[PDB]
């Protein structure tokens, strides 16, 4: 699996199930096929949207660039509402830059328009770790309080990952 | 420390480990620290204040030292709070 | 002393997105852009001083106006229809600039009022057969969020993690 | 892009009435705001403390027409007093946008039509003062039930009714 | 923020099936639709906490209201006469939609109150020669069951023995 | 489709027949008119749902009211004396109509509350030397039956042996 | 002394449900008061005529959750309607206190958990009014048996137990 | 003729002793404090006038309330646990004062509701994501007696020997 | 007429913009009307499916979803007509 081979298994009580969602990339940011599919969906949605904008006169106002930015915003908003990105708001989801401040007239004369997009694709759950303690009879609440305080503080100030990885 | 257990695992799935003692670091604010001026034969950090995480770390870095008892008492009384 | 010279009340361009179709029309007037905290009263018990507790954010209604002119027929027929579709929303785009005439000089991103519902549509403010004012198209929108996206300045950023 | 066609003026609209089965020939020189109002409710998604507004319960607010009270308005008064007495009778308001310099209106597009209007108010005389010099104004308040347009190449108030 | 706008209070259409008669009249108001459980208190003997035990399901009375208009004579007669036939009962159909004006866009089936008995028929809520409100025709119904069958949502699937 | 208007609250005229007297005074107000069913609860044994069984029909008390004016002494005496005769009954005639001033359009017959007994006669609702409201004659009646015969709609046909 | 920490607001809680074996992701925007109530008996010590109060028969009063009725609530309706049909099935209520501004919840402490709750009332539609503008209100009444909290550091509710 | 402006509704500070715990949190609100007398009717036989006979003294339930803030978990647990111990009691201390801001000037002792039992604990009066009011911790108490011991002015002195 | 509204039912055009002075001099006035007449039910088709015990609700959900989606996409008529 770390080498990019996705296995198919015959699990009792489940049937035939794919137990892998990794790509062949060595890039840690596109490890999962879900991220690749999300990026492809964004790109193809935008391309199909802009197909109607191709071969449109660039009038004096250059309002077509602002219209393109508007269309990009609405398209990506619906992708956020579908749920492809991570966060709690569109501001944490995606950002767009397609105004005339990024368009060079020399390229416009040739018919070139540049648009810049940033997105935060959603992630997945691959392996789930259960770290469970066995307490004595009576000290459950005290042990929970202490351990929970420690864990929450470490995560809050970023020292949770600070530590060796077992085996 | 209780978060990296699943890092060196390739197969997907649910796995179980034991909940160990997780260290809770201190926030940096005045008078959360104690500076012990002592001597160790191995001059690893000669005249250089070095943070110590516990008595085991103190022994590993400095080995023998007459301040080992003081270090142990400090850690026992501080219970993970404060820095040495 | 004074250098950058501040923004004028006319220093913004207002645009609309109505459902899935992009409007090319501009609006010559927009009301205040605000984030209001509905406030609650409480006491700590140590004093008779009245304390105020913020809560229940809301972005108040925004009234846009422009000159009623031919070509606003689609604008009307779509502002009428936005609310009929529970998926459709109105998005407001405000670009701050420093225009002289038609020489706008945009700087920073554009403030975006997202997920706005139509509360009122008034193609004709009034009729006076011997009046001389310009007919005023008006539209009231209830926004649900504010952000800023398209530039090097984030004019608005809601609190988020990190 | 630029200003090619001048916008409508406040005087660019001619107002006419239909009172039951009567096609009134008189014109109205003042009409109030034309609106579609959405009565709004408040709600939350539970994921935030932001107040969301929910439209509903459409209503077209009252429209007040005014004109100069002149002889020949007696039939108009007697019709407006009597419209409501007949449960079948309705008042229809016809607003034609034009571009009139003097009496040279240039109609373009269809006519906005306020259909199924009830009379809420009829004021033949706004006031009396033997020292006053203003023209007496005949006013009428109408509660409309619908808006459309059918009179020309440009339709101004197409409802999304068409499924 | 939000995606699908929630149903408004005006987002339902109400119809009646009175015995063997299908009524085309629409009702403007309806009371709340519930499934209540009567409750009994008990204890497990191991503690002094009062535990609640559901039982004796009841669907509470539902009050429909509309504007009393001509053509409601047959509705009045049918509602008055329905209980005289032990076989006859009233069915209530409530379809959720997103009405703009006359532009309902329904999705899902419809909530059907099945086997309802009339408990009150009030053609006239009151009379006042100075009043201005529309006369209200009210009807109280006691339903026995709720289901839903005419669409693709099915929002009242009661529990059933699913083999 | 707004065609025939609905009846308004002011769209009815109320008259009384007190014993053998055909009283000509019109009443300004009346309470609700229904056919109430008393109910019992039961079960079919095959489920735990509570089913409702109608029974013991009743027509609830109707409170008529009007402005207390001279010439009402006759009405007061008649309503005070009607119950003294076991044969005497009070009949209530309600004619719906599309009212506009003194113009009306009566359509259909008239609801008739038949065999009503007087339960309360209040010539004066209250006295207040500083008050300004019109004194109100009130009369509470307990009807036994409801029918309709005056016209061409007959909208209270009780079930009969057809 | 001086308010270092602003107190919780009425909007500072997030409410979630566990219906039987189902984990509902829907959030509720309203909840009634959370209490531990003691039923009291009157007594006297015999040395005075003062009436003394004796606690006993603890009860956690009914909790009414409410939210906006929107599509995707059909599963919630069915689950709430069917939960009481299984004697092993219960409803759990999770209330996480937080310090949210918009969508920026700041949860500190654990969550108050109403454990072993039975449904007493399910009202998908609080009212229907074709002229109203309020949002349709889903309501659900629950009878909890016990309250605890397990998640974050702060244990809000801890019932007295053996030391 | 008025010299001392009278006590206001805001002129009291409320504190709790929960069992063996001296809770330092101050409460913002409290209900009425009385010594109510239940009554029986009688007659002296020589007239038809109904005479009232006092008896069965009672101190009606008192509802304290405050703003629900962090650090109140200790208070919640203490008030939830106090009734579990038959020896444990809740004491309410009310100090009258004339506070301008934080400048309370107490005069007299403090009224003490002694031997109070918890009848109701409501950490959250209600929840509403659109609401803006401060969440209210409420606690209902049933006192058995009232006295006062601190400063010069004794406020409550029951008839002793 | 067919339609929930007049704007669905009918439309008129008879103003002066459609009148020609030459025809008016002869006494001619032109009016243009459009209407959508109501239709009738001629044949009613019952498509009823027989279901095993228990699976009625699931079968109904599946079939209703398919039928509604087809109708709203307009694919319902795209096919061959059976006799």
3-state DSSP of F62-75: EEEEEECCCCHHHH
**Which one-letter DSSP state was computed for residue H134?**
B
CB G60 within 8 A of CB G148: no
Nearest to D17, CA basis, from D68, D78, D80, D60 = D80
F145 bridge partner residues: F114
Sequence-distant (6+) residues with CB within 8 A of B83 are B26, B32, B33, B34, B51
* Dist CA E53 CA F71 (whole Å): 65
CA H141 to chain centre: 8
Radius of gyration of chain B (CA): 17
Task: Give the count of Cβ contacts less than 8 A between chain C and G.
Answer: 29
The sign one gets for the Cα dihedral G68, G70, G72, G75 is positive
Please count the residues of chain D: 163
Give the other-Cβ count within 10 Å of D41's Cβ.
20
The sign one gets for the Cα dihedral G32, G38, G41, G42 is negative
Q: Which residues of E touch C83 (CB under 8 A)?
A: 100
Give the other-Cβ count within 10 Å of E158's Cβ.
14
Nearest to D110, CA basis, from E101, I29, I17 = I17
**What b/e readout covers E84-109, taking b as 16+ CB neighbours within 10 angstroms?**
eeeebbbbbbbbbbbbbbbbbebebb
**Residue of G53, G134, G154, G160 to mutate for H, most H C-beta atoms under 10 A:** G53
* Dist CA C78 CA E94 (whole Å): 29
Q: Provide the terminal-to-terminal Cα distance of chain G, rounded to the nearest Å.
A: 33
Q: What are residue E78's phi and psi, to 5 degrees?
A: -65, -45
G78 touches chain H (CB under 8 A): no
Give the strand order in the sheet containing F21-27.
E127-128, F29-30, F62-67, F136-148, F111-122, F90-96, F12-18, F21-27
Q: How many CA atoms does the CB half-sphere of B53 hold within 13 Å?
A: 9
Task: Give the count of Cβ contacts less than 8 A between chain D and I.
Answer: 32
Task: Give the count of Cβ contacts less than 8 A between chain D and H.
Answer: 9
- C-chain residue closest to D13, CA distance: C127
SS3 at position A81: helix
| Yes or no, beta carbons of C53 and G6 under 8 Å apart | yes
**Runs of H (alpha helix) within B5-67:** 55-62
Q: Which residues of C touch H134 (CB under 8 A)?
A: 40-42, 53
CA distance I71 to chain D (A): 13
Find tokens 């409290």 and name the residue. H30
Sequence-distant (6+) residues with CB within 8 A of D158 are C77, C80, D148, D149, I7
* Dist CA B4 CA B2 (whole Å): 6
CA distance G151 to chain A (A): 8
Give the other-Cβ count within 10 Å of I37's Cβ.
8
Sequence-distant (6+) residues with CB within 8 A of H97 are H11, H12, H13, H104, H105, H106, H107
H138 bridge partner residues: H65, H122
* Dist CA C162 CA C19 (whole Å): 32
Sequence-distant (6+) residues with CB within 8 A of E149 are E109, E110, E112, I60
CA distance D41 to chain G (A): 4
**Which one-letter DSSP state was computed for residue A102?**
G
Q: Which of A88, A95, A101 faces C106 most closely, judged by CB atoms? A: A101
**Which one-letter DSSP state was computed for residue D9?**
B
Chain H neighbors (3+ CB pairs < 8 Å):
C, D, G
**Runs of H (alpha helix) within H12-144:** 72-81
CA distance C139 to chain D (A): 9
Find tokens 């454990």 and name the residue. G115
Give the other-Cβ count within 10 Å of I81's Cβ.
5
**What b/e readout covers F25-35, taking b as 16+ CB neighbours within 10 angstroms?**
eebbbbbbbbb
What H or E segment, with its residue span, contains residue C21? Answer: strand C21-22
| Yes or no, beta carbons of G50 and H57 under 8 Å apart | yes
| Beta pairing class for A127-132 and B13-18 | parallel
Method: cryo-EM
CA angle F121/F125/F129 to nearest 5° reads 145
G34 bridge partner residues: H124
Tokens of A57: 């006169």
CA distance B10 to chain A (A): 6
Q: Which of C24, C145, C151 faces A63 most closely, judged by CB atoms? A: C24
Nearest to C58, CA basis, from G102, G104, G101, D50 = D50
- A-chain residue closest to C107, CA distance: A101
What H or E segment, with its residue span, contains residue D55? Answer: strand D52-59
Sequence-distant (6+) residues with CB within 8 A of H58 are G50, G51, H35, H36, H37, H38
Find tokens 């846009």 and name the residue. C64
**Which one-letter DSSP state was computed for residue A38?**
H
- Region class of G57: left (phi > 0), else alpha (psi between -120 and 50), else beta: left
F6 bridge partner residues: none
What H or E segment, with its residue span, contains residue F79? Answer: helix F72-81
CB B20 within 8 A of CB A135: no
Looking at chain H, which runs of residues are DSSP E strands? 12-18, 21-27, 36-42, 51-58, 62-67, 90-96, 111-124, 127-128, 136-148
| Yes or no, beta carbons of E156 and G81 under 8 Å apart | yes
* Dist CA H2 CA D128 (whole Å): 60
Show the 3-state SS of chain E.
CCCCCCCECCCEEEEEEECCEECCCCECEECCEEEEEEEEEECCCCCCECEEEEEEEECCCEEEEEECCCCCHHHHHHHHHHCCCCCCCEEEEEEECCCCCCCCCCCCCCEEEEEEEEEEEECECCEECCCCCECEEEEEEEEEEEEECCCCCCCCCCCCCCC
* Dist CA D93 CA D15 (whole Å): 7
Cβ-in-10-Å burial (0-12, 13-18, 19+) of C6 comes to exposed
CA angle G97/G100/G102 to nearest 5° reads 150
| Beta pairing class for F62-67 and F136-148 | antiparallel
A45 touches chain C (CB under 8 A): no
* Dist CA H133 CA H155 (whole Å): 35
Give the other-Cβ count within 10 Å of F111's Cβ.
23
What H or E segment, with its residue span, contains residue G74? Answer: helix G74-83
Tokens of E113: 């109150």
G29 touches chain E (CB under 8 A): no
A145 touches chain G (CB under 8 A): yes
Q: Which of E122, E128, E145 faces F10 most closely, judged by CB atoms? A: E128
**Which whole-number Å values give the CA distances from C157 to A141, C112, C148, in the listed order?**
40, 11, 7
* Dist CA D83 CA A163 (whole Å): 86
E54 bridge partner residues: E39
H27 touches chain G (CB under 8 A): no
* Dist CA E2 CA D52 (whole Å): 9
**Which whole-number Å values give the CA distances from I59 to A57, A106, G71, I54, I65, in the listed order?**
52, 62, 21, 10, 10
- H-chain residue closest to C38, CA distance: H132
**What b/e readout covers E138-154, taking b as 16+ CB neighbours within 10 angstroms?**
bbbbbbbebebeebbbb
Nearest to G113, CA basis, from G11, G22, G34 = G34
The resolution, in angstroms to one decimal, equals 3.3
CB C131 within 8 A of CB D10: yes
Q: Which of G11, G15, G67 faces D49 most closely, judged by CB atoms? A: G11
Tokens of F154: 């007959």
Tokens of E11: 């987002």
**Residue of G88, G123, G125 to mutate for E, most E C-beta atoms under 10 A:** G125
CB G146 within 8 A of CB G60: yes
Q: Which of B7, B16, B24 faces A150 most closely, judged by CB atoms? A: B24
- H-chain residue closest to C49, CA distance: H101
Sequence-distant (6+) residues with CB within 8 A of I43 are none
Q: Provide the terminal-to-terminal Cα distance of chain E, rounded to the nearest Å.
A: 41
Looking at F46-135, which runs of residues are DSSP E strands? 51-58, 62-67, 90-96, 111-122
Q: Which residues of B touch A163 (CB under 8 A)?
A: 1-4
Tokens of E10: 């005006």
D81 touches chain G (CB under 8 A): no
* Dist CA E160 CA E148 (whole Å): 14
Sequence-distant (6+) residues with CB within 8 A of E66 are E25, E26, E27, E28, E29, E136, E137
| Yes or no, beta carbons of F7 and E73 under 8 Å apart | no
C159 touches chain D (CB under 8 A): no
| Beta pairing class for E111-122 and E90-96 | antiparallel
Sequence-distant (6+) residues with CB within 8 A of G131 are D57, E10, E28
* Dist CA D17 CA D29 (whole Å): 12
Sequence-distant (6+) residues with CB within 8 A of H116 are H62, H89, H90, H91, H92, H141, H142, H143, H144
CB G80 within 8 A of CB G122: yes
C50 touches chain H (CB under 8 A): no
- Region class of F56: left (phi > 0), else alpha (psi between -120 and 50), else beta: left
| Yes or no, beta carbons of G152 and A148 under 8 Å apart | yes
Tokens of C45: 């018990």
Q: Which residues of I touch D107 (CB under 8 A)?
A: 15-17
Using CA atoms of F96, F97, F101, F102 in order, give the dihedral in degrees to the nearest 10: -90
* Dist CA D115 CA F1 (whole Å): 11
* Dist CA E16 CA E116 (whole Å): 10
| Yes or no, beta carbons of D163 and E105 under 8 Å apart | yes
Q: Provide the terminal-to-terminal Cα distance of chain B, rounded to the nearest Å.
A: 21
C12 bridge partner residues: C96
Radius of gyration of chain G (CA): 19
| Yes or no, beta carbons of A70 and C17 under 8 Å apart | yes
What H or E segment, with its residue span, contains residue A127? Answer: strand A127-132
Q: Which residues of B touch A21 (CB under 8 A)?
A: 12
Find tokens 């310099």 and name the residue. D101
Give the other-Cβ count within 10 Å of F10's Cβ.
18
C126 touches chain G (CB under 8 A): no
């Amino acid at each position: 699996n770390p080498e990019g081979v996705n296995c198919i298994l015959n699990k009792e009580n489940y049937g035939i199930v794919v137990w892998g969602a990794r790509t062949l990339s060595a890039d840690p940011n596109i490890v999962f096929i879900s991220t690749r599919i999300i990026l492809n969906i964004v790109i193809n949605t935008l391309n199909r949207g802009y197909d109607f904008d191709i071969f449109n006169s660039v009038g004096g106002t250059a309002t077509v660039l602002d219209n393109i930015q508007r269309k990009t915003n609405t398209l990506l908003t619906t992708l956020y509402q579908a749920g492809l990105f991570y966060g709690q708001t569109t501001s944490e989801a995606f950002s767009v830059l397609g105004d005339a401040s990024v368009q060079v007239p020399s390229l416009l004369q040739q018919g070139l328009v540049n648009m810049f997009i940033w997105v935060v694709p959603s992630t997945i759950i691959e392996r789930l770790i259960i770290n469970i303690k066995q307490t004595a009879i009576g000290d459950l609440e005290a042990t929970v309080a202490l351990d929970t305080a420690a864990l929450q503080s470490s995560v809050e100030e970023g020292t949770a990952t600070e530590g060796t990885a077992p085996v | 420390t209780n978060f990296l257990n699943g890092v060196n695992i390739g197969t997907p799935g649910a796995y179980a480990f034991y909940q160990t003692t997780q260290s809770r670091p201190i926030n940096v604010e005045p008078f959360r620290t104690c500076y012990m001026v002592g001597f160790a034969s191995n001059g690893v950090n000669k005249n250089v204040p070095t943070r110590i995480s516990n008595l085991t770390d103190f022994t590993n870095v400095y080995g023998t030292s007459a301040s080992t008892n003081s270090v142990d008492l400090f850690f026992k009384n501080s219970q993970g709070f404060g820095n040495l | 002393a004074v250098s950058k010279r501040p923004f004028s009340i006319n220093s913004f361009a207002v645009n609309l997105n109505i459902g899935n179709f992009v409007d090319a029309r501009y609006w010559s007037k927009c009301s205040k852009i605000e984030k209001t905290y509905n406030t609650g009263e409480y006491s700590d018990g140590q004093s008779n001083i009245i304390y105020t507790l913020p809560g229940a954010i809301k972005y108040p209604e925004v009234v846009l106006s422009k000159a009623f002119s031919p070509g606003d027929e689609e604008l009307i027929n779509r502002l009428i229809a936005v609310n009929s579709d529970p998926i459709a929303w109105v998005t407001v785009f405000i670009q701050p600039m420093y225009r002289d005439g038609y020489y706008n000089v945009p700087q920073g991103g554009k403030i975006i009022l997202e997920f706005c519902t139509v509360a009122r549509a008034t193609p004709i403010n009034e009729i006076d057969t011997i009046g001389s004012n310009a007919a005023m198209f008006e539209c009231a929108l209830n926004p649900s969020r504010i952000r800023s996206d398209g530039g090097n300045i984030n004019w608005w950023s809601e609190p988020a993690a990190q």
